[PDB]
Write a protein that binds this DNA or RNA. Structure first.
Ligand SMILES: [Ca+2]
Ligand SMILES: [Ca+2]
Length: 291
DNA sequence: GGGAATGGCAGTATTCATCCACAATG
DNA sequence: CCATTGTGGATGAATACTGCCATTCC
């Protein structure tokens, strides 16, 4: 139950944190400010480590297979705000944080208890996440601006990347089938997935790491990006050294370790033998979704 | 003591992680 | 022919994010 490096924490928050402002009609209006991280059960240790680092927030069972860290206590939200002022987000979520902070200022002056303050908060919430609800849209009609200044920041350091990869990353051992034979070959893959809205950040991964490609997929109004590396030299020389030096967190750390085992076997060309390929096929079976 | 704050979850939509096919390349 | 590398395909659930009653407290 250790504590997490602050920049790793910011990286993970950029990946899977959420800043919320919630307004519902009571009988007037109730207003709540909340930071939330929702993860699969297997990574409850992450939430505990985050909790151990901030000394705020509650950890709750969320359904059958998920757990959540909730921070709603107003005094405790100060702790969060101060962290992200010293170690700032760099994805578009930073915009949500800014609005989160602006709403915090309104409530600190107790102005959410007056009608004029509510109208300010509604304007803020309109630009946050999924925006206003239909209750709010009906109660406050017209086109409330959803527009928001676009965030354009570089990756601060590798500690941030390790936190962000701990959330959005993928370390895969792939068995390549061909058509004229039945023997399979091994290929290692590193991937990072993200919505198109952070296209500039994703493209910078190529330069920042020194390898890889950016691919886009599109399904109706759905689209996302994929930073992808396959060339073994780059994976062995440019990806593995980075995460060995900057440690991952959660279950995905164990995936990276098994990933490196396979890489060492490929490096020693033991994967072209049959005792080696067998051990690799075993390691593949028990990592990622197989674990 | 009534409402404001916070706890304590369950719910919903999708942005992710993931396993995979097949073509291209030397 | 073999081994590596490239370009995404396609999936479904782990996320992001939200809704609301219960409890605290002041
Ligand atoms: Ca994310
Ligand atoms: Ca994740």
């Amino acid at each position: 139950r250790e504590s997490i490096n602050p920049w790793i924490l910011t990286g993970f928050a950029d990946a899977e944190g959420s800043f919320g402002l919630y307004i519902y009609n009571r009988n007037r209006y109730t207003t709540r400010l909340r930071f939330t991280i929702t993860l699969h059960n297997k990574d409850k240790s992450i939430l505990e480590n985050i909790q151990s680092t901030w000394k705020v927030g509650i950890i709750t069972n969320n359904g059958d297979n998920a757990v959540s860290l909730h921070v709603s206590r107003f005094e405790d939200l100060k702790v969060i705000i101060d962290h992200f002022e010293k170690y700032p987000l760099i994805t578009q979520k930073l915009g949500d944080y800014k609005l989160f902070k602006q709403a915090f200022s309104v409530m600190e002056n107790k102005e959410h208890l007056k009608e004029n303050g509510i109208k300010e908060l509604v304007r803020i919430k309109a630009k946050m996440n999924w925006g206003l609800t239909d209750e709010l849209k009906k109660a406050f009609p017209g086109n409330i601006s959803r527009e928001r200044p676009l965030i354009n920041k570089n990756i601060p350091n590798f500690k941030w990347l390790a936190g962000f990869t701990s959330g959005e990353g993928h370390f895969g051992v792939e068995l390549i089938k061909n058509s004229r034979n039945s023997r399979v070959h091994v290929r290692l893959r590193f991937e990072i997935a993200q919505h198109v809205r952070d296209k500039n950040l994703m493209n910078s991964l190529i330069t920042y790491l020194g390898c890889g490609y950016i691919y886009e997929q599109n399904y109706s109004e759905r689209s996302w990006l994929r930073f992808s590396v396959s060339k073994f030299s780059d994976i062995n020389d440019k990806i593995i050294p980075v995460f060995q030096e900057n440690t991952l967190i959660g279950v995905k750390l164990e995936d990276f370790e098994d990933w490196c085992k396979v890489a060492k076997l490929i490096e020693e060309k033991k994967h072209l033998t049959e005792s080696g390929l067998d051990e690799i096929k075993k390691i593949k079976l028990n990592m990622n979704k197989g674990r």
